[PDB]
Amino acid sequence: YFQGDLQATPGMFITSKKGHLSEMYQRVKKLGSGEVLLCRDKVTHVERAIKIIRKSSNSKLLEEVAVLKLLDHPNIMKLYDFFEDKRNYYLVMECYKGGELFDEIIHRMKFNEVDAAVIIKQVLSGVTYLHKHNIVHRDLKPENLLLESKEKDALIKIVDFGLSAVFENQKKMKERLGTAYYIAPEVLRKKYDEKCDVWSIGVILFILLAGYPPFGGQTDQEILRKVEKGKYTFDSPEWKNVSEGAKDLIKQMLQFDSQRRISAQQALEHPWIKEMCSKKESLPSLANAIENMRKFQNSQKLAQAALLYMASKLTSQEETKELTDIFRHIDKNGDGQLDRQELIDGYSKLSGEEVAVFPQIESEVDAILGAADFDRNGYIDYSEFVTVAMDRKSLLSKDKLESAFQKFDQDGNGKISVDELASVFLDHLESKTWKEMISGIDSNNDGDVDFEEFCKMIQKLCSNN
Numbered sequence: 190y191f192q193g194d195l196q197a198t199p200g201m202f203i204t205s206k207k208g209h210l211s212e213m214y215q216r217v218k219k220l221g222s223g224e225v226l227l228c229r230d231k232v233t234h235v236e237r238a239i240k241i242i243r244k245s246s247n248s249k250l251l252e253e254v255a256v257l258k259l260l261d262h263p264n265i266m267k268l269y270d271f272f273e274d275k276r277n278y279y280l281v282m283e284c285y286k287g288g289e290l291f292d293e294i295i296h297r298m299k300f301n302e303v304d305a306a307v308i309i310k311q312v313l314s315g316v317t318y319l320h321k322h323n324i325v326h327r328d329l330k331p332e333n334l335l336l337e338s339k340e341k342d343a344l345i346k347i348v349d350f351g352l353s354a355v356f357e358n359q360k361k362m363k364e365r366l367g368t369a370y371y372i373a374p375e376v377l378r379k380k381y382d383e384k385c386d387v388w389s390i391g392v393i394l395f396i397l398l399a400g401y402p403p404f405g406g407q408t409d410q411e412i413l414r415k416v417e418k419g420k421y422t423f424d425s426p427e428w429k430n431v432s433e434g435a436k437d438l439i440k441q442m443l444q445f446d447s448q449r450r451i452s453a454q455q456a457l458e459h460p461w462i463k464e465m466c467s468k469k470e471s472l473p474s475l476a477n478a479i480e481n482m483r484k485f486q487n488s489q490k491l492a493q494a495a496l497l498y499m500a501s502k503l504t505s506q507e508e509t510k511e512l513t514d515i516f517r518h519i520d521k522n523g524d525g526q527l528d529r530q531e532l533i534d535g536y537s538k539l540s541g542e543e544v545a546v547f548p549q550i551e552s553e554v555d556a557i558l559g560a561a562d563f564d565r566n567g568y569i570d571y572s573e574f575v576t577v578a579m580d581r582k583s584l585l586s587k588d589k590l591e592s593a594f595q596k597f598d599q600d601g602n603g604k605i606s607v608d609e610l611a612s613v614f615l616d617h618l619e620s621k622t623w624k625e626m627i628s629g630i631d632s633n634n635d636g637d638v639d640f641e642e643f644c645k646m647i648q649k650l651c652s653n654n
């Protein structure tokens with residue numbers, strides 16, 4: 190291996206490891222009853238939501254963890270850590286305190302068109318990203334949509350991937366799963382694809398605007414027979430003042446024919462979404478972002494891995510708020526990835542300076558892509574953007590450097606060894622590459638990386654030219 194072969198990804202920080210709950214977390218309170226527990230990190234004091242699942246029959250959970258570790262989008266849940274005991278599996282998740290969207294529906298009872306569009310565009314953005322990564326949720330409903338915070342513009346987070354699946358473009362899914370009000374009729378017929386999720390969102394949008402479901406009944410039997418027929422109506426007084434554009438989107442998402450049904454990507458682009466979200470937006474720019482991004486060119490892989498962990502797993506909502514809003518703006522199609530053309534079009538928000546019609550901008554975009562694209566997938570992913578654009582004063586705080594070092598130092602002896610370096614990303618392979626990656630930053634010739642050496646390497650990376 191060479192260093193140019195290594196890839197820093199958010200998923201590499203999650204691996205099946207042996208651990209005890211009491212060793213690293215303190216129990217605060219029971220959040221769900223399978224058990225959701227609010228816990229406090231014994232070192233950083235950060236509170237996290239831990240899903241305790243009791244103990245191949247355990248293959249379903251491992252496949253879910255394999256999906257969960259990949260999830261990197263402003264509108265999708267984040268998995269902080271994963272560990273196991275002799276009896277239980279521990280899914281350490283980022284805690285969201287704004288409640289479920291279900292709670293807001295019960296309290297508000299109905300949403301205006303602008304509010305409904307803002308929420309639904311976020312669900313569609315999350316779903317567009319899932320579908321592009323061959324993931325189908327299969328249980329989208331207001332109970333599985335959490336609000337980030339209790340703050341006014343708090344982001345929607347898609348949660349509960351328990352019924353999720355990796356789908357194939359050539360094969361239809363057969364498992365009848367979901368919730369009575371939200372289930373697509375083709376799921377009931379045991380022959381469906383990812384369009385089943387678009388149906389679920391259509392039902393959610395109908396509820397937001399009207400305050401009642403499109404397929405109702407006193408029993409599940411009544412609801413499902415209405416779902417099977419696929420017949421619903423806007424002929425109710427709750428719909429009198431609702432625009433033609435909102436009804437048009439619902440009709441396309443609740444299109445009985447899966448092939449003719451709007452995709453999550455196309456629904457995000459719908460004229461009603463565009464009009465309503467433009468009303469809400471009617472906006473800050475980044476300073477010295479291009480110079481900061483250029484620092485990552487040819488940078489040490491251990492330094493990339495450290496900063497990626499600090500930015501993606503160690504930063505608060507308050508620290509990333511402005512970055513997430515800029516990312517969402519540049520990400521025109523809301524797929525959670527910034528492609529070459531998106532970077533070109535939204536360049537004025539990155540550089541700060543205004544772009545004229547007259548080449549240089551395309552060269553700078555390819556330089557940014559070469560530096561920030563840590564996994565070499567051709568895009569600047571969400572966590573990659575947060576890493577390369579974050580201000581130094583916030584990203585390089587002592588507590589973040591301490592936690593990043595502690596994560597990589599598996600045995601906790603105060604030194605990152607050759608075995609641990611290969612484990613941060615390649616565990617089985619023995620190579621002079623790991624030894625040489627360390628020797629380049631080793632100041633006391635002991636063949637290990639101590640906290641001081643770790644900090645100096647990161648400081649050299651984010652230092653002025």
Ligand SMILES: Nc1ncnc2c1ncn2[C@@H]1O[C@H](COP(=O)(O)OP(=O)(O)NP(=O)(O)O)[C@@H](O)[C@H]1O
Pocket residue numbers: 220221222225238266282283284285286288289332333335348349
């Ligand atoms: N990351 C999280 N942050 C905060 N709360 C969470 C998080 N994940 C799950 N919860 C809450 O944990 C509680 C139980 O979730 P869970 O057991 O997965 O579903 P449930 O018991 O069927 N309730 P529901 O999701 O409304 O159908 C719910 O109140 C969730 O909102």
Ligand SMILES: [Ca+2]
Pocket residue numbers: 520521522523524525526527528531
């Ligand atoms: Ca995009």
Ligand SMILES: [Ca+2]
Pocket residue numbers: 561562563564565566567568569570573
């Ligand atoms: Ca990338």
Ligand SMILES: [Ca+2]
Pocket residue numbers: 598599600601602603604605606609
């Ligand atoms: Ca060690």
Ligand SMILES: [Ca+2]
Pocket residue numbers: 631632633634635636637638639642
């Ligand atoms: Ca050393």
Ligand SMILES: [Mg+2]
Pocket residue numbers: 332333349
């Ligand atoms: Mg649930």
